[PDB]
Amino acid sequence: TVIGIRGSDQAIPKFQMNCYAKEDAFSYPRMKYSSKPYKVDNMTRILPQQSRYISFIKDDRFVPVRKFKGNNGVVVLRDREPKEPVALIETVRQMKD
Amino acid sequence: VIKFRAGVCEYNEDSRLCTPIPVQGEIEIKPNEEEELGFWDFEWRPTEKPVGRELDPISLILIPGETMWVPIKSSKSGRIFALVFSSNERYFFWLQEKNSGNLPLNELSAKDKEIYNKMIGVLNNSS
């Protein structure tokens, strides 16, 4: 999972942080480092690696203190600018939880 | 507990309201929080989005036995839960579920036929 989350209670603002990996989220079932914007960073395939050829945009409201901690699952774009744009996103949690 | 469809609005001691007032959830008039005392703590909770609002003290206390259901008498727009106790303590619970249309001769409010005699009873019920 790569999901915006927050360094706070989560508006789940999602963004694709876009630093290029040779694309293995595009290598995956049907049915390297260019430091270029990667296409799409939000959840799905990623990879621990294809995580780590990508880096955040600073320009969103929220920024991690850890400088792209590097772990897709752990997500949590740390929350720098709430009650604003970077909109809002929710989940079945937010539904029930 | 006996459950009801509304948020917890601005109680609006006076100055008749139900301006939009999110608190979108289910406020539930119920026998306090212990399900024992004649007190009705009005159980509010979303599985909903109440625009991050409650306006309820985890549920709303009620002083029993003088509680009457004012239908939304002193009519404004659609439903609220209009609990008029002293006409001061008045506790309004924001209309969220608007069902069977606004109907006359129950609440004169947007959601009544179910919830009216539900709110009627639960305030006038023995339990």
Q: What is the DSSP string of B94-123?
A: E-----S-SBTTTTSBSS-HHHHHHHHHHH
Tokens representing A62? 């929220």
How many beta-carbon pairs under 8 angstroms link A with B?
3
DSSP state of B35: T
- Kind plus residue range of the DSSP H or E element containing A51: helix A48-52
Dihedral sign, Cα of residue A49, residue A50, residue A55, residue A56 = negative
Provide the β-strand partners of residue A35.
Answer: none
Dihedral sign, Cα of residue B32, residue B34, residue B35, residue B38 = negative
Q: What was the elucidation method?
A: cryo-EM
Within 8 A of B47 by CB-CB distance, chain A residues are 95-96
Please tell me the distance in Å from B14's CA to the nearest CA on chain A: 31
A92 touches chain B (CB under 8 A): no
Q: Which residue has the tokens 């001691």?
A: B13
CB atoms within 10 A of CB B69: 23
Could you tell me if A6 and A79 are in contact, meaning their C-beta atoms sit under 8 angstroms apart? yes
> What is the experimental resolution, given in Å to one decimal place?
4.8
Say whether B9 sits in a helix, a strand or coil. coil
Tokens representing B90? 């008045």
CA distances from A14 to A37, B1, B60, B82, B113 (A): 16, 39, 37, 41, 43
Tokens representing B60? 């709303």
Could you tell me if B35 and B51 are in contact, meaning their C-beta atoms sit under 8 angstroms apart? no
Count, in order, helices (H) and strands (E) of chain A: 2, 0
